[PDB]
Amino acid sequence: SHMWIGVISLFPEMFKAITEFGVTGRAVKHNLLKVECWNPRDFTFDKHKTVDDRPYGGGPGMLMMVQPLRDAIHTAKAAAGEGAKVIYLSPQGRKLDQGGVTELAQNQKLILVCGRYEGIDERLIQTEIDEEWSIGDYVLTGGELPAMTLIDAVARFIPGVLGDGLLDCPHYTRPEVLEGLTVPPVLMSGHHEEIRKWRLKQSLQRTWLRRPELLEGLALTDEQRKLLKEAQAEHNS
């Protein structure tokens, strides 16, 4: 009924974007979702609060310094108590999709470690991280946007937060005519079953035209096979 997410980040104020606004902001205010951040800079001891360090072997960039990051992670783990899964966000991780969101959402506690600079020491991944997850095959400046993405996606599964393999159907609202384009008459018919079938058929058609590989992974129902065949025949004029 409740999810707790610990976050380790050099920029914890970024997480206001999900804790103060919208559906996820409401979830936090209503105690359905709790997001708690620890900043490695607070675990430094030198006068200039150093949180990066030079990579062995040379190279352009810097890495996160091990001692402050490690101490922040340990503090988060102590706060979480038993049973928290520790996740490092990176492009080398398991690719996130909705199946994986649904899996992650089964956890009552997560700790999310956000890398900065060129990333974190490999031995910390070995000794502190349970799983690595990627939000997609593109490179970002840090792990915070992937962590927020993951939080937002799992939050949708917490009961009370909100009020099947296919792409969504098109949606229409007022006015009935917009730049000469009319709303499909079936949607104004009030025929609930025709509307259901139209929506399903559109989703099948859109998945086939835009993401046909997604169909290969589905066991279509008899009704879905029929509506898809119909959509494909109509497309073939």
State the binding site for S-adenosyl-L-methionine.
Answer: 88, 115, 135-140
Q: Which residues precede chain breaks (C–N over 2.5 Å) in the chain? A: 163
Using rule CB under 8 A, residue 227 touches a copy of itself: no
Q: At which residue do the structure tokens 């009935």 appear?
A: 176
Using rule CB under 6 A, residue 75 touches ligand 4H9: no
Distance, first Cα to last Cα, the chain: 50
Minimum CB separation from ligand 4H9 for residue 64, in Å? 8
Minimum CB separation from ligand 4H9 for residue 211, in Å? 13
* Contact set for ligand 4H9, span 138-167 (CB under 6 A): 138-140, 142-143, 146
Instruction: Enumerate long-range contacts of 210-216, CB under 8 Å, 24 or more apart.
Output: 210/167, 211/167, 214/165, 214/166, 214/167
Judged by CB under 8 A, the residue of 199, 208, 226, 230 near a copy of itself is 199
Minimum CB separation from ligand 4H9 for residue 30, in Å? 20
Nearer to a copy of itself, 81 or 163 (CB): 163
Using rule CB under 8 A, residue 178 touches a copy of itself: yes
Q: Do 101 and 146 touch, CB atoms closer than 8 A?
A: no
User: Which candidate, 210, 183, 152, places its Cα nearest to that of 14?
Assistant: 152
Using rule CB under 6 A, residue 119 touches ligand 4H9: yes
